[PDB]
Design a protein around this nucleic acid. Structure first.
Ligand SMILES: [Mg+2]
Ligand SMILES: [Mg+2]
Ligand SMILES: [Mg+2]
Ligand SMILES: [Mg+2]
Ligand SMILES: [Mg+2]
Ligand SMILES: [Mg+2]
Ligand SMILES: [Mg+2]
Ligand SMILES: [Mg+2]
Ligand SMILES: [Mg+2]
Ligand SMILES: [Mg+2]
Ligand SMILES: [Mg+2]
Ligand SMILES: [Mg+2]
Ligand SMILES: [Mg+2]
Ligand SMILES: [Mg+2]
Ligand SMILES: [Mg+2]
Ligand SMILES: [Mg+2]
Ligand SMILES: [Mg+2]
Ligand SMILES: [Mg+2]
Ligand SMILES: [Mg+2]
Ligand SMILES: [Mg+2]
Ligand SMILES: [Mg+2]
Ligand SMILES: [Mg+2]
Ligand SMILES: [Mg+2]
Ligand SMILES: [Mg+2]
Ligand SMILES: [Mg+2]
Ligand SMILES: [Mg+2]
Ligand SMILES: [Mg+2]
Ligand SMILES: [Mg+2]
Ligand SMILES: [Mg+2]
Ligand SMILES: [Mg+2]
Ligand SMILES: [Mg+2]
Ligand SMILES: [Mg+2]
Ligand SMILES: [Mg+2]
Ligand SMILES: [Mg+2]
Ligand SMILES: [Mg+2]
Ligand SMILES: [Mg+2]
Ligand SMILES: [Mg+2]
Ligand SMILES: [Mg+2]
Ligand SMILES: [Mg+2]
Ligand SMILES: [Mg+2]
Ligand SMILES: [Mg+2]
Ligand SMILES: [Mg+2]
Ligand SMILES: [Mg+2]
Ligand SMILES: [Mg+2]
Ligand SMILES: [Mg+2]
Ligand SMILES: [Mg+2]
Ligand SMILES: [Mg+2]
Ligand SMILES: [Mg+2]
Ligand SMILES: [Mg+2]
Ligand SMILES: [Mg+2]
Ligand SMILES: [Mg+2]
Ligand SMILES: [Mg+2]
Ligand SMILES: [Zn+2]
Lengths: 275, 65, 96, 115, 88
RNA sequence: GGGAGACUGGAAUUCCUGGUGUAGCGGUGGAAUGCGCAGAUAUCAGGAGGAACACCGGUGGCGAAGGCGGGUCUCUGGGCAGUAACUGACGCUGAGGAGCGAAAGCGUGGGGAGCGAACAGGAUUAGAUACCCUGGUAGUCCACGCCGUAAACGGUGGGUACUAGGUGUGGGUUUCCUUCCUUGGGAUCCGUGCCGUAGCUAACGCAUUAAGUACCCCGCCUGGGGAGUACGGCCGCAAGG
């Protein structure tokens, strides 16, 4: 759950963490690890592509079976629900009957011992990936794909995931966490159940070291920025810039969504906030 | 106040299945009357209430049509 | 091991003959688990009080069940998942 | 246009009453209100205003050519019987009368009491 | 709530004889089985205050019965507490 | 309708989408701020979401008290009648202590249809920082914690024994006119309304569910303000208790 840390030092007074009692193994599988490195917020070209992030704690990579489609009709027990920091959620390894173990996203309330099926015959216990032909309308879903068989991309937020609304014709309607409705094929791949670590939103950061570890760099406010560096720069004292806030990269607040996407016709309306 | 029929041991048992006993106690609008009108009994009309409202939920009698 | 009453309403798009095989296949799970006793009677094609699931009519089937709460809950979970069924419930035949 | 059978919709509030003539499919033909008749304020809430609105709706429907109508009534009583009598006397024949008043099942919460 | 099968099993199996039922031994046995079973239930169901009232009432009742057993005979009290494995 | 979790139903409001359909719709003691001519109101079809369960529903049931009611399942407490098998002084109340607790308020994270403090306008008045109208931010909903106060009233602590009745309701055992249908008649215990003796009370009034006549223990009061306030102590992150 959530465990709050006692104030031993003035720095870690407010630090509270979601204790990971949901851990079973501590040393990740060495076979599936691929060579990875912190890119430092920089491309191969050497320029800093995005500031406020980079540096920190070098970490490893592991392949997740996001698009599980190659093998079907075989069951798998939950091997060990381990901790992968490269995601907000957790990964629970599976012993499939063919002996080919792949990592998958651990759904909410998953504990070691449940049997998971991936295919048409799969039931409604969480972790079962199956096309929309075999799912009731109205069930909460996660790790949702966009086409019948091109790899799953969406619905992997910890705690709130996409909810299926209804099927009409050959197009299916999906409700977004933002409260929006997206039209998607009735043959895409989607799983059942919410994603775990819902209590992760109750994490309290704590200090700056954790944050350089996590990746982000300290944020430099524009009002003290130099005027050449930023439109908010300059001033003798504290000033807001004398104009509406603007990213120093030229454009102010506003529309950024370029229309006319191939899935733009597959969207009914855009998000509305604070209702 | 007239007689309460179901306090008879010769009277039929009360349940959600018998639509005749269900709709003999419901108004044409679709409503259940009062003890003062019907003359019937209290735990008795509690049994009718549960039976008929159960039937209404299973869509055997209208919802105030 | 308590007497239960269940009623199932099916979509009218299915013919009357298929109901019996469908219901017996549905309740085979209880038949094979607890060694239970059942009774089945059928009557359908009644005019519904209102539109339900944009439908105007249906078929009624009532089964008396002497089984386990786990078994009846399993039947409920397996059956309400079906799309051809509309509305179902389970009650207690005894005092409670 | 033309239509053999129509439907009459009447609603009456404590301070207003409006009438509309529609097809059984829901396609309206004409509507009439005491405000369009020319009453201001609570003068619009009077049953005679309902009479005038009913006769205006009936006339504007008879140029459209409707013979048989059924009346649906809703809302608190201000002029139900008076309005239906005016509609019947205007030259139209009523088949059935139905009171479909919106009644909540303790849905939402009614406004605060009047003091 | 316990039912006939296990309840008669308990009353006989902790009974002094095959007929006595209201003996303090059987009474404490029924109270203990009830409290462990329904405490297991309340480990899942948290905010059932009306049932925690039953917990407290049955526990105070139990405490009175155990006090009576200790008063009437130390040996039987010790045997009972040792056979059920509790603290007091 | 005792409590908790889950599943599920219909009506209604609002909003969105698409027809039809025209200049008004909403409002009060009267009118104007409000929305319309960019197509309102009305009305039909569909969908979305949130709250609460009209009739049954009552001076009726349960809970120790706050309180509790759409159905269904799951688990569970309390109470009542008969047989009376068994335990054989285990009963009662309970200072300090500990647990529960209306609404509002606070933190975190979600939800948010309707309603609605605060705040804007419109209206009345010599004057309105109110009563009235149009809007609507907390809150009202959910989960985890908190504060622990109400005219928290039956303004009456609990338990036991005794003391005339009449009239209703609920639950269960029996017996007899006996159809053996019948609030038929009778006996019994529990709960809950009304009126009434003797009695008590300053009076209103209570009257077997006592304020009657007593027993056991516990809290509270000693003229009105000051004042349920200052200081001190305890709890609460704070409001505060
Ligand atoms: Mg801190
Ligand atoms: Mg790697
Ligand atoms: Mg270059
Ligand atoms: Mg940044
Ligand atoms: Mg480095
Ligand atoms: Mg993590
Ligand atoms: Mg900055
Ligand atoms: Mg600077
Ligand atoms: Mg510049
Ligand atoms: Mg430079
Ligand atoms: Mg400067
Ligand atoms: Mg300055
Ligand atoms: Mg700007
Ligand atoms: Mg959105
Ligand atoms: Mg009954
Ligand atoms: Mg008026
Ligand atoms: Mg109003
Ligand atoms: Mg019980
Ligand atoms: Mg709960
Ligand atoms: Mg429309
Ligand atoms: Mg509309
Ligand atoms: Mg909402
Ligand atoms: Mg004896
Ligand atoms: Mg006692
Ligand atoms: Mg005591
Ligand atoms: Mg004591
Ligand atoms: Mg004390
Ligand atoms: Mg005390
Ligand atoms: Mg406590
Ligand atoms: Mg506490
Ligand atoms: Mg409240
Ligand atoms: Mg509250
Ligand atoms: Mg506040
Ligand atoms: Mg809070
Ligand atoms: Mg919040
Ligand atoms: Mg409002
Ligand atoms: Mg107000
Ligand atoms: Mg403004
Ligand atoms: Mg004002
Ligand atoms: Mg007080
Ligand atoms: Mg109270
Ligand atoms: Mg008291
Ligand atoms: Mg006493
Ligand atoms: Mg009595
Ligand atoms: Mg006297
Ligand atoms: Mg006197
Ligand atoms: Mg009296
Ligand atoms: Mg008394
Ligand atoms: Mg006295
Ligand atoms: Mg003063
Ligand atoms: Mg004082
Ligand atoms: Mg002090
Ligand atoms: Zn009766």
């Amino acid at each position: 759950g959530i465990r709050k840390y006692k104030p031993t030092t003035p720095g870690r007074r407010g630090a509270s963490v979601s204790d990971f009692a949901e851990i079973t193994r501590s040393t990740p599988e060495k076979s599936l690890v691929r060579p990875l490195h912190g890119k430092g917020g920089r491309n191969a070209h050497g320029r800093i592509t995005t500031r406020h992030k980079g540096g920190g704690h070098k970490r490893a990579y592991r392949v997740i079976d996001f698009r599980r489609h190659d093998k079907d009709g075989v069951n798998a027990k939950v091997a060990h629900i381990e901790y992968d920091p490269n995601r907000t959620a957790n990964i629970a390894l599976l012993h499939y009957l063919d002996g080919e173990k792949r990592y998958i996203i651990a759904p909410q309330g998953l504990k070691q011992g449940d049997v998971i099926e991936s295919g048409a015959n799969a039931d409604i216990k969480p972790g079962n990936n199956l096309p929309l032909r075999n799912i009731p309308a109205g069930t909460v879903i996660h790790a949702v794909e966009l086409r019948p068989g091109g790899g799953a991309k969406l619905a992997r937020s910890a705690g709130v995931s996409i909810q299926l609304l209804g099927k009409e014709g050959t197009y299916a309607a999906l409700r977004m966490p933002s409260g929006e409705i997206r039209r998607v094929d009735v043959r895409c791949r989607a799983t059942v159940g919410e994603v775990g670590n819902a209590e992760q939103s109750n994490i309290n950061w704590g200090k700056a070291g954790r944050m350089r570890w996590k990746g982000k760099r300290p944020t430099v406010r524009g009002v003290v920025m130099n005027p050449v560096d930023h439109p908010h720069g300059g001033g003798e004292g504290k000033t807001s810039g004398g104009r509406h806030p603007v990213s120093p990269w030229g454009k102010p607040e506003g529309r950024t969504r370029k229309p006319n996407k191939p899935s733009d016709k597959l969207i009914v309306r855009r998000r509305r906030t604070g209702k | 106040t007239r007689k309460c029929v179901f306090c008879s041991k010769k009277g039929q048992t009360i349940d959600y299945k018998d639509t005749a006993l269900l709709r003999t106690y419901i108004s044409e609008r679709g409503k259940i009357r009062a003890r003062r009108v019907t003359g019937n009994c209290v735990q008795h009309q509690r049994d009718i209430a549960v039976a008929v409202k159960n039937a209404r939920e299973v869509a055997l009698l209208p919802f105030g049509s | 091991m308590r007497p239960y009453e269940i009623m199932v309403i099916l979509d009218p798009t299915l013919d009357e003959r298929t109901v019996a095989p469908s219901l017996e296949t549905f309740l085979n799970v209880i038949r094979k688990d607890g060694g239970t006793v059942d009774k089945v009677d059928i009557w359908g094609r009644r005019r519904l009080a209102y539109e339900i699931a944009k439908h105007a009519e249906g078929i009624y089937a009532v089964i008396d069940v002497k089984a386990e709460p786990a078994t009846v809950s399993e039947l409920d979970r397996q059956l309400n998942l079906n799309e051809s069924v509309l509305r179902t419930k389970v009650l207690r035949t005894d005092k409670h | 246009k033309n239509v053999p059978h129509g439907a009459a919709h009447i609603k009456s509030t404590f301070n207003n009453t409006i009438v509309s003539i529609t097809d059984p499919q829901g396609n309206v033909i004409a509507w009439a209100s005491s405000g369009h008749v020319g009453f201001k304020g609570s003068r619009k809430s009077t049953p005679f205003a309902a009479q005038l609105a009913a006769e205006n709706a009936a006339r504007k429907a008879q140029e459209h050519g409707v013979k048989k109508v059924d009346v649906f009534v809703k809302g608190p009583g201000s002029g139900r019987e008076t309005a239906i009598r005016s509609l019947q006397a205007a030259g139209l024949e009523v088949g059935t009368i139905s009171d479909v008043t919106p009644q909540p099942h303790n849905g939402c919460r009614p406004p605060k009491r009047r003091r | 709530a316990l039912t006939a099968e296990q309840k008669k099993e308990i009353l006989g199996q902790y009974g002094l004889h095959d007929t006595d039922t209201g003996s303090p031994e059987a009474q404490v046995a029924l109270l203990t089985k009830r409290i462990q079973d329904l405490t297991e239930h309340l480990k899942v169901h948290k905010h059932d205050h009306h049932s925690r009232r039953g917990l407290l009432l049955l526990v105070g009742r139990r405490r009175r019965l155990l006090k009576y057993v200790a008063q009437v005979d130390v040996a039987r009290y010790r045997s009972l507490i040792e056979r059920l494995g509790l603290r007091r």
